[PDB]
Subunit: 261 residues, 6 copies
C-alpha cells in the first residue's frame, strides 16, 4: 500500500491507498491531532498504532504539510522507521503539471496544489475546490488545469471555538445542525450561526468566483467539489456545491507520488 | 446629556447623546478597548478624560455589558462617581417592552435586547438586526415586536485573527477589500476570504431567515438593519441588508433609560 | 464487560465493569488527560492500548462528556469502533429516573446527573454528593430521588495553579498535607491554604445545605458521599463527609446503561 | 498628604492619608488593575489622574509591591516625578518592630508584614488577619506582636475565574450573593459555591488556627480582622471573623513610613 | 516641537524634539506599553496626558511602527485630534536616502531603516547598529551609507520572560547584573545568563560581521553604536561597542520628517 | 537493560542502556514531548510502545524530572507497571558524590547534577558543560569534582519560538544554519541571529568563566563538553567547546543508579 500523510494546522489525515494509477483506491483513512512540537518517535508510534500490520507492506510514503517542523519530523521518522520505502515530501510551490499562475508560485500551500491536481485529474475541466480544513481554502482550476488562485476563509470549527473563547456568555458547543435557522437557546443560536452562516460563506464565495471571472460562469461547465471533515455537515445547506470527495487530497498525493516515482 | 456605555467582549463604546425622545441624537462617541480586569476608578478616569467637561452637564447614564466583571465594576462606578444623576443598568432579561420569546430569557445578551428594542422603535415592523462585533449577532424581531431569537456567527476580525494565529504561514493582515475574488498572493486570498466569505455568511443567514420563518418572506416588509464598527467594510458586498445604523445600541440604551425613568 | 467513559474538563476516566445489577463492580480503571482536540481515532487507539485483550469481550459501552468536542468525537468513535455492542451516550437532560427540579434541566452537566443517580441508588434516601474534579460539584438529592440543585465551587488543583500563575513568588507546587495549619515558609503556607481551606470550604457548604433547606437537618438521615481523584487528600480533614465512593460515576453510568438497555 | 501604594498580583490600591500618628486617617483610596509590565510614565500618568491636585501637597510616599518589577518602576516614577518627597520602598523582610518568627523572614511578602504591623498596632494583642486579595492571606500575630505565620489560600475571584475558564459548561459570573446555598441554575450554583465555600474556607482556616496553636483558644481574647475588596461580600457569611477594617494595609504603610522617618 | 513615535512590539517611545538640523535635540521622552489592539481615542488620551501643554505647540509629527494596526490607529488619531500638524507616517521599506541592498526592500522594518539613517548621519562612515528592543536588531551600514542587512536575535528581557514562563522552577526575576558570571543560586544563574550570554551574543555577532564581510575589518574604521532601553545594562560588559546613542531612532525620525517636508 | 528517563520542561528523553560500569553504553534512545498533566497510565502506554519487547528485560529504572508532577507520575507508573525492578528517582539537590557548593544545594535541578557527575566521571578534571535544552545550562566543575555553579541562559529553539509568537511580523521559522552572517531577508536575519548569536552566547559565557575563575585559564587544561538535541547545529560555530557527547545525561543517570545500589 501507499502511506499518505496530510498535515494541516489542526488535524492530520493518515491514509492507506492500495492499487496504482486509475485503479488505485483509498482503503484506510484516520484523522488525528496535529502537534507542532511532535517528534519523529511520537509520530512513528501513533502512525504504527493506526496502520497496524500494514507497515511491512508499504511500498511508498507520500506526505505534505502546512507546518514545516512537522514535515521535517516526518522526514526524520520516515528515514528512521521506514528506510526501504521511497518517499516524496512536498513543500509549498511543488511542481506537478499544474501551472501556478500566481504572484508567488513558491508560497502557495501544498494542500491547495494537491487538491487542484486531484480535481483536474478527476474532472478534466474547470473546477472550484472547497477544502474545509483549519481554514476553508477555495482553489480555482482553469480548463487547462492551471491554478489561478482563490480564497482563504476561516474554518468553521476554528472560528466557532474562537468566538466561544472570546466571549463570556458564549460557551463551547458541538458543531451540529440546529432545528431551525432561528435559535431559541444560546447553543441553538451558536449552531445556527456556525452551520448556516458558513454554508452561506461557501455559497457566496463560489457564486462570486463564478460571476467575476471569465470561463467560470453559469453557461460554462465547472465542477464544484468539496472536501474535508466538516464538509458533509454543511453539504445539505450548500446550493452551489455539486460533488463531495472525501479522499481528494489523498488521491492527489498519490498522483504526485506516481509522478515523482 | 446622556452617557451611554456599551461594554462588548472586545471594545467598549462610550456615547454622549443630547435631546429627548424623537429629538435625541448621538453628539459624541468614542471607542476604547474592553479590559476584563478594569476597575471602577480606571474606567471613570478614562471616561472623564474622554468626555471632558461634560460630566457636570450629564442628566443620566445608562450601561450594558456582555462581560460580567466589567458589569460589576460599572455598577460600582455608577454608584460611586455620578450619584446625582439617574442610572439604569441592563442585565440579561431586563424590562424593555420587547417580549423575549426564547427558552432562557435570562441568558440572552443585553446587546441583543437593546438592538431589538431600537430596531423595532425605529421601524415598527418585523426586523432583522445584524450586529458586527466579536461575534456577528443576528436578531429576529416579529411584527408585534417580539424577540424570536436568531443566530450567533463568528465575527470577521476574531475569526481572521484566529486563522492567522493557528497557522505559522499566515501573518496578521488588515481587513480591507481585495482587488478580485480570486486572489493572487496569500494576503489577497486571505482578504478575499475574510471579506467576501463573511458578506456571503451574512447574506446566507438573512436569506435563510427570510425563507424559513413565517412572516419574513419577500412578500412581507422586513427591515434589515446592520450595526457595528466593522459593518461598513462588508456593507458594499451585502445584498440582503437595506439599512445601516451605527448608533443603534446607543439609541436602544436611550430608549431603556427613558422607559425606566 | 461494560466500558464506561467519564470525560471531564481535565482528566478522563476509562473503566471496565463486570457483572450486572447488584453483583456489578469496577474491575479496571485508568485515568488519562482530556484533550479538547482529540479525535475518535486517537481516543480509540489509547482506549485499545489501555484495555488490551478486553476489546473483544465488551458487552456494552456507556459514556458522558462535559466537553462538547470530546462528546462529538466520542459519538463518532462509538459508532465507528464498537458497532456490534449497544452504546448509551449521556447528554444533559437525560432520562434516568431522577427528576431535575432546576431552572434549566438541559444545562446541568452529565456528571452531576450520573452522580445523583448512583447516590440515590446506593443510599435510597436524601443525599449530598461532593465530586472533587476540575470544580467541586455539590449535588443535593431529596428523599424521593429528585435533583434539587447544589453548588459549583472552584477546585483545589485548578485554583492553586491559577494562584501560582498569577503571582511571581508562587511556583508550581505539589499538593500535600502540611505539618501544621500555621506554615513557616511559602510552600507550607500555600499547602495549608489549599488543603485546610478547601476542607473548610466543603464542610461549610455541606453544613449550610444541612441548615438552610428542609429535609436535610441533623434530625434527618442524610448520606454525605464524596467522589473524585483528589478527594482522598482532603478526606482526613473533613468532618461532614461520611462515605467515600471512588467509582460513583462509573456505577451511575452502568445504571443508565441498564435502564436504557 | 502621604501617598500609599499597594501593588498586588491583580490590583493596586492607591491611598492618600492625612494627619500624623494617632490623629492620622485615610482620606482617599482608589483601586486599579495591576499591569506586570507597566512603565514609570504610564503609572505616573494614572496616579496623577487619580490623585488630581494633591500632587503638590504630598509630604512623602510609602510603597510596597508583591511584583518587584512594578516596585522598581515605582521607584523610578517617584525619583522622576516626585523628587522633593521622601520615599520608603518596602521589600520582603522589612524591619517594622514586628519580629518575623518564621523560617525565611526575607521571603514573606510585604503586604503580610504591613497587615501584621497595622493589626498589632490597632489591637495590641493576639490577632488573626484575613486579607482578601489576589490570594487570601491569613496572618497570626501573638500577644507580643510577632509574625508566627499563617496560610495562603487561592482568592475568591481568581479561583472563580479559573474555574469558569477551565470548564466548558461554566462561564464567567458576577461575584454576588445568591438566593440560597442550593442553586437552581449554573450561575446560581457558581455564585453559591464561590461565596459560601470561600466563607467556609475562611471559617475553617480561622477555627483550625484557633484550635491548633498555643494561646489562641476561644477562652483567650483574640481579635479577628478582615480586610480586602471582597471582604464585605463574605463578611455576613462568616462566623469566626469579628472586625472589618478596609484601610489596614494603608495604615500599616503609614506606620512603616513614620518608623523610617 | 516634533512629536516622534516608535511603536515596537512591546513598548512605545514617545519623544518631543525641538530645533532643526544640527540645532535639534530630544527634549522629552516617555516609554509606555504597546497595546496591539489599542484605539485612536485611548492613544490620543495617553499621548495628550504625556505631552501636557505642548499639544498646541506641535509643528509636526513623525511615526513608525512594527505593528501595522497601531500605525493605522496613529493615522486616525493624528487626523482626528491634531488636524493642523503635518504627519509623515513611515511604513517598512521607506525611501530615506539610504539604499536598501537586500532581497526584499519592502519587508525590512522601519525601525532598522531609521537607525541606519541616523547612524550614517552621525558617523558618515561604516557603522554597525545594535538595537536592543523586543528583539536584538543588528544593522550593517556600508561606508557609502547603504543598508547591507544584518541579524535579528531574540531580545534579552523577552527571552528571560519566555524562560520564566516555560519553566516552573524559573520565576519572574528582575533584569540586573549579578555578582559574578558563576551564579551561586537560581536567580543569580538566570541573571548571569541573561546579561553575560547576551553580551557575548552581541559581541559574537559584531565580531563575525567585522570578520566575514568586505570593508568592515578591524583595520578599517567602523563605528559600532548601541541603542535601546536595556542597552545600558549590557553596555559595560561589551568589548565591541564604542558608542551608545539613546535617541538614535528619534533622530532618524526627525531626519525622515525633515526630508519628506 | 537500564531504563533512563529525562523529563525536561519541553521534551522527554527515554533511554535503554546495556552493560555495567565501563562496559555500559546506550543502545536505544527516543525523544518525545513533555506534557505537564500527563498521567501514569498514559506515560506507561507511550513508554511501553516506545521500548517494545525490552519491557520484560528491564533491570532498573533511573529517572529525573525538572517537572515534579511528571516525576511523581513516573513513580506511580513504575510501581504500578514495573513493580519487580528497582527505581531510583532523583529530586533536585540529589547526592551523587559531587559536592554542591552553592547557596541552596537543594534547589539546583537534577539534570545539572547528572550532567556534572557524568562529565567529571568522563574527564576526571575541571570541566565546562554546555547542555542545550529548553534553556541553555552551563555548568562549571572544579578539579576536585565539585559543582561550582554556572549559568542558565534562554534556549535556542525556545527563544526563537517565543520571538516568532510575540512579534506579529515574524512567523515560525525552522532552526537551521544560514548562508551568511549578514542576512539578506527577514528569515536569513532571524536564522543568523538564532545560530551565530547563540553560538556567541555560549562562547562568551565559556570564555568569561575561563577568565574569571581560578584554574580555568588557557594554561590550565579544562575539558569543554557539549550535549543536547540542538547542540550539533551550533557546534560548528563554536570555538571554546572541544567535545560533544549526546548521551551525557543518560550515562549520568546510569552512574546514579549504580551508586544508589
Amino acid at each position: 500500500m501507499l502511506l499518505a500523510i496530510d498535515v494541516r494546522n489542526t488535524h492530520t489525515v493518515v491514509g492507506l491507498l492500495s492499487g496504482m494509477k486509475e485503479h488505485a483506491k483509498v482503503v484506510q483513512q484516520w484523522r488525528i491531532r496535529t502537534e507542532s512540537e511532535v517528534t519523529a518517535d511520537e509520530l512513528a508510534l501513533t502512525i504504527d498504532g493506526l496502520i497496524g500490520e500494514d507497515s511491512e507492506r508499504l511500498t511508498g510514503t507520500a506526505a505534505l504539510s502546512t507546518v514545516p517542523s512537522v514535515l521535517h519530523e516526518v522526514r526524520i521518522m520516515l528515514d528512521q522507521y521506514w528506510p526501504s520505502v521511497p518517499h516524496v515530501l512536498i513543500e509549498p510551490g511543488v511542481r506537478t503539471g499544474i501551472p501556478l499562475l500566481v504572484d508567488n508560485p513558491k508560497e502557495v500551500g501544498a494542500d491547495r496544489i494537491v487538491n487542484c491536481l486531484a480535481a483536474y485529474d478527476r474532472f478534466r475541466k474547470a473546477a472550484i475546490v472547497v477544502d474545509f480544513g483549519s481554514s476553508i481554502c477555495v482553489d480555482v482550476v482553469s480548463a487547462k488545469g492551471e491554478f489561478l488562485g482563490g480564497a482563504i476563509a476561516p474554518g468553521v470549527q476554528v472560528s466557532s471555538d474562537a468566538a466561544a473563547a472570546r466571549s463570556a456568555a458564549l460557551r463551547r458547543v458541538e458543531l451540529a445542525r440546529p432545528r431551525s435557522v432561528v435559535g431559541k437557546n444560546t447553543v441553538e443560536c451558536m449552531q445556527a450561526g456556525a452551520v448556516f452562516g458558513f454554508a452561506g460563506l461557501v455559497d457566496g464565495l463560489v457564486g462570486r468566483i463564478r460571476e467575476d471571472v471569465s470561463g467560470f460562469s453559469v453557461d460554462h461547465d465547472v465542477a464544484i467539489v468539496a472536501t474535508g471533515h466538516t464538509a458533509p455537515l454543511l453539504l445539505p445547506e450548500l446550493h452551489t456545491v455539486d460533488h463531495y470527495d472525501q479522499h481528494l487530497t489523498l488521491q492527489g498525493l498519490r498522483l504526485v507520488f506516481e509522478r515523482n516515482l
